[PDB]
């Protein structure tokens, strides 16, 4: 019979997808400690409250930095958040391979 | 195919033999045609 | 005996480790610009740049292993609008890819061949004319500048079998095409129709007109012969006004069309008695699909050998083919050379084996 016409996907973008996935895993390890369905991150004490603390997370506009109590920070320094609950404002800035308009450069309107 | 949509019949025109291709059924627009090779020498 | 003496500088290898067919030097490079060449193999083409003092280096390597592709030719050219070197590659499936090593991006892809493209050559007067001797029992002339099929040589009495390679004259006045049908027919480009079609393609645009490009199918060549080579002929060239065609007869016979006195340009199409003058003879070179090449000044003609030996022919001297010339041997030559290429200046030549392992030589000068 006639074989598959042509694999339009993965002709050239397979390596770009691997690079993006490598960057994502190295930055967040969401596939390792994020349980696959949530964002894994590492926190550090950038700020604190004279008496709470600020376990700021490294990825900017990906895993938001929150404010927690001193004992609360010392216990749950790392917060794991589902991608479903991630904000929609910075999700687009998190990675450019999720949704970007292809033909919007011209025509469109 | 075993169920062609066309058939061949040779007709003698003006003292000459010329093969004419004829449709077996009402063929709708734009499909891939057929012809039973068993009719010809090369089946 | 010849007044030439080359010396090897340095070599290299390739990632794919596959046979390499298409190889030429960048003869279009002028003084000052370091010499470069190209080689092919598997689905990954590789370039290189080897400096003086016996040193070699690599610069680029493009892979096209998305499908089961394969490369056959690496014809060199250049783009007048950009003054950048170009490298056209084709084979296997039959897509003519025009790589641009400077920007490392593909430029043009060409479809329409019924089988694998076997050879490629460029028009000396116009760098935009590439001759593709396709395997579909025909030969094709493409116009890269306007992306049209200028002329489809073949028809009722043309290319009974696959056309392997076709060359150009000293000025490109006449075209000969060796083939697999024992044919050496000279599809001349001297008729007025060919020039008119070339001009039309020069001022043609597929967007402008709805109808396709009206190609010219040359069913009948301006001259033909079937008795010079007993077997199929794979390489052809134009030694001056004579013919430098080559077949599996381990000889590049230097014959002339017609009788011994009649002009080639005025030979009648019905002539059936050509005359042979001489042939350069060697041994252990009986394999098929190999390409030979002379220099720019025609004084040095070279052909590869499957054993590994290399030959250079001195043709600037008087008289027809004679003497014994010089044979070049390399310390690391074990495989089959598929294409040899000198430089524009008589200083540098590199042979390429069936592992994309270029061995570059430098003449004493």
């Amino acid at each position: 019979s006639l074989p598959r016409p042509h694999d339009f996907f993965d002709a050239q973008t397979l390596d770009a997808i691997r690079h993006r996935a490598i960057c994502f895993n190295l930055s967040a390890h969401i596939e390792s400690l994020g349980k696959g369905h949530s964002v894994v991150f590492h926190s550090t004490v950038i700020a604190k409250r004279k008496e709470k603390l600020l376990l700021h997370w490294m990825p900017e506009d990906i895993l938001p930095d929150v404010w927690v109590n001193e004992s609360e920070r010392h216990q749950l320094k790392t917060k794991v958040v589902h991608l479903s609950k991630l904000p929609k404002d910075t999700a687009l800035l998190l990675d450019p391979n999720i949704y970007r308009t292809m033909p919007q450069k011209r025509l469109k309107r | 195919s075993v169920n062609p949509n066309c058939y061949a019949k040779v007709m003698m025109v003006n003292g000459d033999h010329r093969i004419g291709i004829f449709a077996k059924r009402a063929i709708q627009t734009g499909e891939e045609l057929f012809f039973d090779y068993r009719y010809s020498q090369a089946d | 005996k010849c007044k030439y003496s080359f010396k090897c500088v340095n070599s290299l290898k390739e990632d794919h480790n596959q046979p390499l067919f298409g190889v030429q030097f960048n003869w279009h490079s002028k003084e000052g610009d370091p010499l470069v060449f190209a080689t092919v193999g598997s689905n990954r083409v590789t370039l290189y740049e080897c400096h003086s003092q016996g040193e070699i280096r690599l610069l680029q390597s493009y892979v096209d292993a998305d499908a089961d592709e394969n490369f056959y030719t690496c014809a060199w050219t250049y783009d007048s609008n950009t003054s950048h070197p170009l490298l056209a590659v084709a084979g296997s499936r039959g897509i003519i890819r025009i790589i641009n090593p400077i920007t490392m991006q593909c430029i043009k892809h060409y479809v329409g061949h019924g089988n694998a493209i076997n050879e490629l050559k460029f028009h000396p007067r116009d760098p935009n004319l590439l001759l593709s001797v396709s395997k579909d029992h025909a030969l094709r002339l493409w116009n890269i500048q306007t992306d049209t099929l200028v002329a489809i040589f073949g028809g009722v009495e043309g290319h009974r079998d696959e056309v392997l390679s076709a060359d150009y004259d000293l000025l490109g006045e006449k075209i000969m095409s060796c083939g697999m049908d024992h044919s050496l027919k000279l599809w001349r480009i001297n008729s007025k129709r060919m020039m008119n079609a070339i001009k039309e393609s020069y001022d043609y645009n597929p967007n402008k007109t709805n109808r396709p490009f009206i190609s010219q199918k040359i069913h009948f060549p301006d001259f033909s012969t079937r008795d010079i080579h007993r077997n199929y002929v794979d390489c052809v060239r134009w030694l001056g006004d004579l013919i430098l065609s080559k077949s599996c007869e381990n000889a590049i016979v230097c014959w002339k069309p017609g009788k011994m006195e009649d002009d080639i340009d005025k030979i009648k199409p019905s002539e059936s008695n050509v005359t042979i003058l001489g042939r350069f003879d060697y041994s252990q070179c009986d394999i098929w699909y190999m390409r030979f090449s002379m220099d720019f000044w025609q004084k040095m003609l070279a052909l590869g050998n499957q054993v590994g030996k290399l030959y250079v022919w001195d043709l600037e001297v008087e008289d027809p083919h004679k003497a014994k010339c010089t044979t070049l041997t390399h310390h690391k030559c074990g495989a089959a050379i598929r294409q040899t290429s000198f430089s524009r200046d008589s200083s540098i030549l590199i042979a390429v084996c069936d592992d994309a392992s270029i061995w570059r030589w430098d003449r004493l000068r």
């Binding site: 960057c23 895993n25 190295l26 390890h29 596939e31 390792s32 | - | -």
Partner: protein
């Protein structure tokens, strides 16, 4: 039986220095 399927299979898209150690850094793709 490498417990969770992710920890042994999804370590193929990040198949370089992004596996975050764990069983992925070990012989997860192989036996």
């Amino acid at each position: 039986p490498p417990a969770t399927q992710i920890s042994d299979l999804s370590k193929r898209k990040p198949k370089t220095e992004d596996f975050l150690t764990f069983l992925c850094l070990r012989g997860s793709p192989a036996l």
